């Protein structure tokens, strides 16, 4: 009975891990999209800094 219980627990843990593996795929994908958008954000922030500086010089 002990070995059957152990087998049942291992099958269940395989199940929990089978769920976990799907979740981490969704997670890697989210991170790839967020990396691209964070690159976009950095570029836009630099562009905004430069534009604001150019207006600062203009008003001066």
């Amino acid at each position: 009975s002990r070995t059957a219980e152990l087998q049942a627990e291992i099958d269940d843990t395989v199940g929990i891990m089978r769920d976990n593996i799907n979740k981490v795929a969704e997670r890697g994908e989210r991170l790839t999209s967020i990396e691209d958008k964070a690159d976009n954000l950095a570029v836009s922030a630099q562009g905004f800094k430069r534009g604001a500086n150019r207006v600062r010089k203009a008003m001066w």
């Binding site: 799907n22 795929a25 969704e26 994908e29 999209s33």
Partner: protein, 268 residues
Amino acid sequence: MSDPVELLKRAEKKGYKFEEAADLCVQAATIYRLRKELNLAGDSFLKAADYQKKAGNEDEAGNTYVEAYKCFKSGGNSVNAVDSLENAIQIFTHRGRGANFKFELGEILENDLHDYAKAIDCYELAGEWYAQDQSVALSNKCFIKCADLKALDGQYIEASDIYSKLIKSSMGSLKDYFLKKGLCQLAATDAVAAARTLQEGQSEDPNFADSRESNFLKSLIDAVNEGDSEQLSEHCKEFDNFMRLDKWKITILNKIKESIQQQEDDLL
């Protein structure tokens, strides 16, 4: 704080002029949002977005439409949220996001408005564009939603095709995909196709071959072949006892059992 009504009146009077009117509308609308009058704030973002469109600032209009969608959804106005998402999607698609907001729109349609056909269309389109972005899983998620709704909507063949696409993209969820696909093929009375799917899954994916899902699908195929509805019910209960069934499977197997009953009607 300025009166939002006076700001809206000034924006209408001014409606560079469009930009100023949009700014006034945005101010009045932020005041509304601060007052938790979410629907009025959404209407004011919508007016600002329309003025921005008239001004040529399409990106600003789309952002304001997204804000309109956000506040309408928080305010419980699903229809205006759907409209705002549609304008934002059109602006974004026209500008080179459409998929993200189309997925959100499909979610809104499926849960809030129960417009399942439009939700299916939104999910299919979002999945196609996500596929267009090589985001295999977002397209896969959209296709899961699309296939689920399509199978629940009576379109079993199309749902099975989408499940095949999911299987091909995920090769190299699959265990379920195969099962679901077979179930759909069995809802369409095509037991041969279900057997072909089971064999393909067993031979291509070693994990699915030894999986409980494979045995359950084989048992269902055998039950439909012998026309033993009670045996199918027993197999369903056995499958439920170890792995809980979901409402999608409940519906598919209920239509299958009713199809066995319809065959019994054809027996006479």
